[PDB]
Amino acid sequence: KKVNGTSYKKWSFDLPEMSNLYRLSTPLRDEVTDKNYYYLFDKKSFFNGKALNNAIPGGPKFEPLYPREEEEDYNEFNSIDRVIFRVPIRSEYKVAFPHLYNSRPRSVRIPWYNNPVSCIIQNDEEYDTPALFFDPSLNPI
Amino acid sequence: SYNGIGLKSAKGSSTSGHVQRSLASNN
Amino acid sequence: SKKTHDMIWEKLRYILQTQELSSTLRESLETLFEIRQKDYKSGSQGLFILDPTSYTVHTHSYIVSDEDEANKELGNFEKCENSQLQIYDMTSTNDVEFKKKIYLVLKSSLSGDEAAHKLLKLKIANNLKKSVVDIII
Amino acid sequence: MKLIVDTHVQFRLGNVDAFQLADGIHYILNHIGQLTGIYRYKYKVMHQIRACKDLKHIIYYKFNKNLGKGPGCGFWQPAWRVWLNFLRGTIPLLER
Amino acid sequence: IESAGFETDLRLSTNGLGMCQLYFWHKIWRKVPGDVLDKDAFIPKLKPAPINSLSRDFVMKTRRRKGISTGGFMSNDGPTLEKYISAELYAQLRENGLVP
RNA sequence: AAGCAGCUUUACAGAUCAAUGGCGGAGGGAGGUCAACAUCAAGAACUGUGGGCCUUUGCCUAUAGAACUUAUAACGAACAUGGUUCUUGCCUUUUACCAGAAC
Ligand SMILES: O=P(O)(O)O[C@H]1[C@H](OP(=O)(O)O)[C@@H](OP(=O)(O)O)[C@H](OP(=O)(O)O)[C@@H](OP(=O)(O)O)[C@H]1OP(=O)(O)O
Incomplete structure (x- = not known):
């Protein structure tokens, strides 16, 4: 009932046994679960950084995907006497909205936009607090 | 952040590519 | 006494939610729950001028439900029938080693x-800055 | 291979204890550039030698929080995988 | 004009907690904090202009964007009342200190 | 959700011990670090079956069955090497190499 057989191909466990393995595996599986943690720090944002030759802080760097930028048209369009400087476009913006904040983006993938702000309440200290209980972090109604 | 400053790589360059903001630059 | 002190918090929370109260006192009652989530970092500053052993711990176990004898009769008058080695440094290697660092910059x-x-x-520290303008010149 | 196999022989002879066995297996896998000359003959294995050194920097800092310095970290499962994956590509080439 | 990357800055500085929404159904307008005819106001080239030179900057950059004013490298041709009336009545206007 | 009747079986005593009707059975059941074969990336995507058009491929319409693998895309919640061809790095040449791309 726990595994299929001696060939050892499938397993099937129970809830007090899965809790006990989950409690034992705390020092290696301790991690930040909610998906908003990885905002601008997931695969596609690393792909967009690689493809735009822009560097997220903490993220890896690569060779330029399109190394030839020496070609240049001397046009009046992006002339600074036309441009209003009000907010510096820092490089996190180029990854978060890649078709807006880049001129000429190539080999770029569309990022995931948002996740609902997570309200999960759990405690680690006292096991004897009940499953349904008012959190000291909650607004009192 | 990268902010449009720096080499494209420190591969043909003979340098490490380390960039720092200047403190003598007033703004 | 965190178990009993949560139950006081548990009972007090019943009042704000399911009971009508006065207006001006109401924002005082919910301010007490606003500090619970900010965790009391504006109510714990004071003069702990004894060490946790230098104060001999006389935690008196009183209650407000017992008699306390009211001995006001003492405040009236009554009638008693009763080794560092101080090396002076003349070498000034320290000022020479700091002058080489600035000249090399x-x-x-x-x-x-x-x-x-x-x-x-x-x-560079504030008291050394006059010494730096002097090396530059 | 003879290096790893003989680390298990010392334990099975009773010369070292279980904690020393794990520390030695974890030491070999992070020091294959120091212990064998494998990079002299196929130099691209310096990718694997530098990835085991990167994993050792991140493991030693988890393991030694509120501990000191000195040996005794035998968590060899991440660097074992790196060498097992290197073998995956070296089998077809050496076979030819 | 100050909103470019407002969402990204909030969503990073509060670690995925926190979220922003921006909308314009109420159609609030507000005065730009400078004076739209002001020659002496300093506009730096690569840095954002200070708050008193701010109305004069937005007028000039849109006049060069649309075409309207032309100059050697950075044009200085304001929207001025004298081009419509005359120089003659504008001479009396400049006399009383009415139009600078 | 109890009892009663009907329904289905059930351990069954049976009317028949014929011809029948139903559910099972024609290779018991669970397993194996056993093996052979088939199959696993594409109009969001599948075969078969019946009719019609054309005279079977095709097409249109009716209908049965679709196991596994895929949407922050895929047999693997994992993750290595080689070849060719560009573009680079280091550079006395070849190997061994640097690091990006396409196949
Ligand atoms: O060079 P250090 O700054 O002194 O760092 C050393 C070094 O690690 P790396 O040179 O790989 O960063 C030692 O490794 P080796 O010198 O043996 O290559 C390592 O010791 P072991 O790898 O032999 O365990 C030791 O770690 P520790 O002293 O905890 O054993 C570690 O020091 P840090 O832990 O301070 O990085």
Whole structure:
């Protein structure tokens, strides 16, 4: 009932046994679960950084995907006497909205936009607090 | 952040590519 | 006494939610729950001027439900029938070793914009800054 | 291979204890550039030698929080995988 | 005009907690904090202009964007009342200090 | 959700011990670090079956069955090497190499 057989191909466990393995595996599986943690720090944002030759802080760097930028048209369009400087476009913006904040983006993938702000309440200290209980972090109604 | 400053790589360059903001630059 | 003290918090929370109260006192009752989530970092500053052993711990176990005898009769008048080795340093190696560090910052720089950046990077103390302008000149 | 196999022989002879066995297996896998000359003959294995050194920097800092310095970290499962994956590509080439 | 990357800055500085929404159904307008005819106001080239030179900057950059004003490298041709009336009545206007 | 009747079986005593009707059975059941074969990336995507058009491929319409693998895309919640061809790095040449791309 726990595994299929001696060939050892499938397993099937129970809830007090899965809790006990989950409690034992705390020092290696301790991690930040909610998906908003990885905002601008997931695969596609690393792909967009690689493809735009822009560097997220903490993220890896690569060779330029399109190394030839020496070609240049001397046009009046992006002339600074036309441009209003009000907010510096820092490089996190180029990854978060890649078709807006880049001129000429190539080999770029569309990022995931948002996740609902997570309200999960759990405690680690006292096991004897009940499953349904008012959190000291909650607004009192 | 990268902010449009720096080499494209420190591969043909003979340098490490380390960039720092200047403190003598007033703004 | 966190178990009993939560139950006081548990009982007090019943009042704000399911009971009508006065207006001006109401924002005082919910302010007490606003500090619970900010965790009391504005109510714990004071004069703990005894060590946790230098104060001999006389935690008196009183209650407000017992008699306390009211001995006001003492405040009236009554009638008693009763080894560091202080080496003076004349070498001044310290001021020589700091002069070499500044002279070398200057001589390793292409421009004076890049020489000032390296001096500003060292973060020299306030009392040494007059000594730095003197080396530059 | 003879290096790893003989680390298990010392334990099975009773010369070292279980904690020393794990520390030695974890030491070999992070020091294959120091212990064998494998990079002299196929130099691209310096990718694997530098990835085991990167994993050792991140493991030693988890393991030694509120501990000191000195040996005794035998968590060899991440660097074992790196060498097992290197073998995956070296089998077809050496076979030819 | 100050909103470019407002969402990204909030969503990073509060670690995925926190979220922003921006909308314009109420159609609030507000005066730009400078004076739209002001020659002496300093506009730096690569840095954002200070708050008193701010109305004069937005007028000039849109006049060069649309075409309207032309100059050597950075044009200085304001929207001025004298081009419509005359120089003659504008001489009396400049006399009383009415139009600078 | 109890009892009663009907329904289905059930351990069954049976009317028949014929011809029948139903559910099972024609290779018991669970397993194996056993093996052979088939199959696993594409109009969001599948075969078969019946009719019609054309005279079976095709097409249109009716209908049965679709196991596994895929949407922050895929047999693997994992993750290595080689070849060719560009573009680079280091550079006395070849190997061994640097690091990006396409196949
Ligand atoms: O060079 P250090 O700054 O002194 O760092 C050393 C070094 O690690 P790396 O050179 O790989 O960063 C030692 O490794 P080796 O010198 O043996 O290559 C390592 O010791 P072991 O790898 O032999 O365990 C030791 O770690 P520790 O002293 O905890 O054993 C570690 O020091 P840090 O832990 O301070 O990085």
